């Protein structure tokens, strides 16, 4: 539960700033012809082995939040540019640093979301800061872990996991009761595996 | 620690056993992360529909496919020469997992990533490819240990560590250090 502050509050913090983008699309597809996918969200495997969102740190000495964000997306040259209209949230990170994390979000068409993936494999950052893109599975299979719970049990950039859960809720892509359910199962899996 | 069985013996197993074939595609990588630490090799893995990391591949019915043709059908060329190993997987059910590996140029490896976003499995069975970071940063978790902290198909995680060893891509002790670092990270995040 990271403390959310207003964008104005954030602009008055010795604090460093990060900007990340959550791109997503309604997804009519059905896995095995049976399981509704509902939505796909894009995340990235980072150079440091963690799953996060496209984006990174923004030096406000040099760039506005928006220009800084678009500089470090690592999504290639498919013509995608985020703006202030896509701004969603600012969160104070729990880190030993002092970081305020800004989240931008935009719903795309599934075709647009796919084109981003295709552009991304050619990014200047590909194989450097970004080791690949992955779609978030939002469904849960019959074994009660396949799909979203297993996915949440991967290793995340801490603020990125918080942001995913926060955005899924506030953008009404998933009932928060369902989110608690999936997270509970992820943590349980993680506990039993460590045993 | 999975029981390894010879190729000879695996292919004598009876109709009760199912066979899986997976491929570890890798390339020597001369790159330098931020100019400071050698990448050495890049290996391909993938996010699956079930939210786990694994290798490309899957089940092959030997009644209708050779192991190689069966593997290549899933991937679509890999040959017997690319075979590495056969392991009996942990139960419930009776599976022997075959591992194939091939070294590619880094350009060839990128060509695989390029073709993968257009495959019929993309967005269904496979949710995206990832490169394994084989380096470790100076905090001793960034890179490979963090990567090993993710959620794997258990057989794939074993095969990755096995293959890195036998292909002489990382020393056994370095593998052990990374896995130990991964595990400690997993412990701490939980509490």
Tokens at A175, concatenated: 């009932």
- Put simply, the answer to whether B113 touches A132 (Cβ < 8 Å) is yes
Region of B57 (left: φ > 0; alpha: ψ -120 to 50; beta: rest) is left
Which of A147, A155, A187 to mutate to test binding with chain B, by most B CBs within 10 Å of its CB? Answer: A155
- Put simply, the answer to whether A150 touches B50 (Cβ < 8 Å) is yes
Is residue B86 within 8 Å of residue B2, measured between CB atoms?
no
d(CA B97, CA B80) in angstroms, rounded, equals 15
* Cα Rg of chain B (Å, integer): 17
Is residue B6 within 8 Å of residue B86, measured between CB atoms?
yes
Say which of A27, A49, A154 has its CB closest to residue B144. A49
- Phi, psi at B170, each rounded to 5°: -145, 145
Residues of chain A with Cβ-Cβ distance to B145 below 8 Å are 49
- Count of structural domains, chain A: 1
Residue with tokens 């403390």: A3
Asked how this structure was determined, the answer is X-ray
The DSSP code for B167 is T
Establish whether the linkage from the previous residue to B92 is cis, with ω within 30° of 0. yes
Say which of A40, A114, A151 has its CB closest to residue B51. A151
Tokens at A118, concatenated: 């295709």
| Helix or strand holding residue B14 (H, E) | none
Minimal C-alpha gap between B67 and chain A (Å): 24
A107: CATH:
3.90.79.10
Residue of chain B whose Cα is closest to the Cα of A188: B190
- Phi, psi at B81, each rounded to 5°: -60, -25
DSSP string, A6-58: -HHHHTT---EEEEEEEEEEEEEEEETTTEEEEEEEEEEEETTS-EE-SEEEE
The DSSP code for A161 is H
Is residue A18 within 8 Å of residue A101, measured between CB atoms?
yes
- Phi, psi at A4, each rounded to 5°: -90, 135
The DSSP code for B125 is T
SS3 A107: strand
- Put simply, the answer to whether B113 touches A131 (Cβ < 8 Å) is no
Displacement of CA A81 from its chain's centroid (Å): 16
Minimal C-alpha gap between A123 and chain B (Å): 12
SS3 B137: coil
Tokens at A168, concatenated: 């899924």
Is residue A42 within 8 Å of residue A117, measured between CB atoms?
yes
- Put simply, the answer to whether B49 touches A117 (Cβ < 8 Å) is no
Torsional sign, CA B31, B36, B38, B39 = negative
Residues of chain B with Cβ-Cβ distance to A27 below 8 Å are 123
Domain that holds residue A193: 1-195
The DSSP code for B76 is -
CB atoms within 10 A of CB A160: 22
Is residue B144 within 8 Å of residue A49, measured between CB atoms?
yes
Which residues partner with A99 through β-bridges?
A: A16
Minimal C-alpha gap between A1 and chain B (Å): 15
> What residues of B are in the A interface, CB distance below 8 Å?
29, 31, 33, 42, 47, 49-53, 110, 113-114, 117-118, 122-124, 127-133, 137, 142-151, 183, 185-187, 189-190
Say which of A50, A131, A134 has its CB closest to residue B127. A134
Minimal C-alpha gap between A12 and chain B (Å): 31
Which of A49, A52, A189 to mutate to test binding with chain B, by most B CBs within 10 Å of its CB? Answer: A49
- Put simply, the answer to whether A146 touches B51 (Cβ < 8 Å) is yes
d(CA A102, CA B92) in angstroms, rounded, equals 45
**Length of chain B in terms of residues written:** 191
d(CA A127, CA B161) in angstroms, rounded, equals 21
SS3 B80: helix
- Put simply, the answer to whether B137 touches A190 (Cβ < 8 Å) is no
> After which residues is chain B discontinuous, taking C to N > 2.5 Å?
76
| Start-end of H helices in chain A | 7-10, 65-71, 110-120, 148-152, 158-170, 176-194
Residues of chain B with Cβ-Cβ distance to A26 below 8 Å are none
| Helix or strand holding residue B20 (H, E) | strand B18-33
Residue among B36, B174, B153 nearest B97 (CA): B153
- Put simply, the answer to whether A149 touches B51 (Cβ < 8 Å) is yes
CB atoms within 10 A of CB A131: 23
């Amino acid at each position: 539960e990271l403390k959310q502050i207003s964008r104005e509050e954030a602009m008055r913090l010795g604090w460093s700033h990060s900007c990340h983008a959550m791109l997503y699309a309604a997804n009519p597809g059905q896995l095995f012809g049976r399981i509704p996918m509902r939505f796909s969200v894009l995340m990235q495997m980072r150079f440091d082995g963690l799953l996060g969102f496209p984006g990174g740190f923004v030096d406000r000495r040099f760039w506005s939040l928006e220009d800084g964000l678009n500089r470090v997306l690592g999504l290639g040259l498919g013509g995608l540019r985020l703006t202030e209209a896509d701004y969603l949230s600012s969160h104070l990170t729990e880190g030993p640093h002092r970081v305020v994390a800004h989240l931008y979000a935009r719903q795309l068409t599934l075709e647009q979301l796919h084109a981003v993936e295709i552009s991304a494999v050619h990014s200047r950052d590909h194989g450097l800061e970004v080791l690949g893109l992955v779609r978030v599975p939002l469904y849960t299979q019959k074994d009660r872990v396949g799909g979203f719970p297993n996915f949440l049990s991967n290793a995340f950039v801490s603020t990125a996991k918080y942001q995913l859960l926060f955005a899924l809720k506030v953008l009404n892509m998933m009932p928060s009761e369902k989110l608690a359910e999936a997270l509970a199962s992820a943590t349980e899996k993680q506990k039993k595996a460590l045993e």
